[PDB]
Write a protein that binds this ligand. Structure first.
Ligand SMILES: [Zn+2]
Length: 99
């Protein structure tokens, strides 16, 4: 019983936080979340608005707002992301899912 989550990042090149940070060179003025937090949480910027995708699970998120925690949003929407899980642990993700 049970298929396994594949281990390959959706976008291995964006596996680097530094490179993910570069993607936010045009992260909008009206956008309310710091790129550093987004890049740290595995997200890189796509498009020209405020859309991001996780380099690993490819979870796509937009409509970012003051206070929005990237790591939390990550756990909220993409709880099985192996990047999120290695970085924040099983406890953290469960803690976000159970609320
Ligand atoms: Zn992810």
């Amino acid at each position: 019983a049970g298929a396994t989550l594949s281990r390959g990042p959706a976008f291995p090149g964006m596996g680097s936080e530094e490179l993910r940070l570069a993607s936010f060179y045009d992260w909008p003025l009206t956008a309310e979340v710091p790129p550093e937090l987004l890049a740290a949480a595995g997200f890189f910027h796509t498009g020209h608005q405020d859309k991001v995708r996780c380099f690993f699970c490819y979870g796509g998120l937009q409509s970012w707002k003051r206070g929005d925690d990237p790591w939390t949003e990550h756990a909220k929407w993409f709880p099985s992301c192996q990047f999120l899980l290695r970085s924040k642990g099983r406890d953290f993700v469960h803690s976000v899912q159970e609320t």
